[PDB]
Amino acid sequence: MVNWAAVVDDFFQELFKAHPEYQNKFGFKGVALGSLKGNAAYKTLAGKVVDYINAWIGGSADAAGLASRHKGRNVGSAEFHNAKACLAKACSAHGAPDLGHAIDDILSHL
Numbered sequence: 001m002v003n004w005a006a007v008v009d010d011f012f013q014e015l016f017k018a019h020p021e022y023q024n025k026f027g028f029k030g031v032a033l034g035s036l037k038g039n040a041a042y043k044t045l046a047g048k049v050v051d052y053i054n055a056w057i058g059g060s061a062d063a064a065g066l067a068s069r070h071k072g073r074n075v076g077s078a079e080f081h082n083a084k085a086c087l088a089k090a091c092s093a094h095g096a097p098d099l100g101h102a103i104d105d106i107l108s109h110l
């Protein structure tokens with residue numbers, strides 16, 4: 001398998017390194033990056049992102065719904081363009097397929 005859990009962990013390391021302020025929107029606001037994996041709010045959230053990736057791969061991803069929910073948190077195109085870059089790094093680091101098309105689908109609804 002691809003270890004998508006590991007890809008997602010590196011995604012968040014990249015994301016919050018480049019944009020620490022994005023972490024303020026989550027239940028793990030203020031938690032040291034190096035300790036995120038031990039945080040309960042983070043574990044649940046990371047699991048859902050993994051689920052979304054597996055839903056995209058499996059053909060059931062709802063990009064319109066995901067976009068709508070993110071707009072509902074005042075998260076928009078600029079943030080998802082930054083996420084796209086961080087996710088490409090995380091995928092590359094693990095020899096995982098690029099997920100750019102999945103992010104482009106979300107971006108099309110933003």
Ligand code: HEM
Binds near residue numbers: 073
């Ligand atoms: C690769 C890009 C991203 C993916 C695949 C993704 C996916 C998800 C998923 C699956 C959830 C779980 C709830 C739901 O399904 O709506 C979620 C929640 C959330 N996302 Fe993202 N997201 C991405 C980028 C971002 C970015 C850049 C931000 C910027 C702050 C963000 C902010 C949030 C917030 C605030 C929540 C809710 C957290 C909570 O309920 O406590 N997302 N996201």
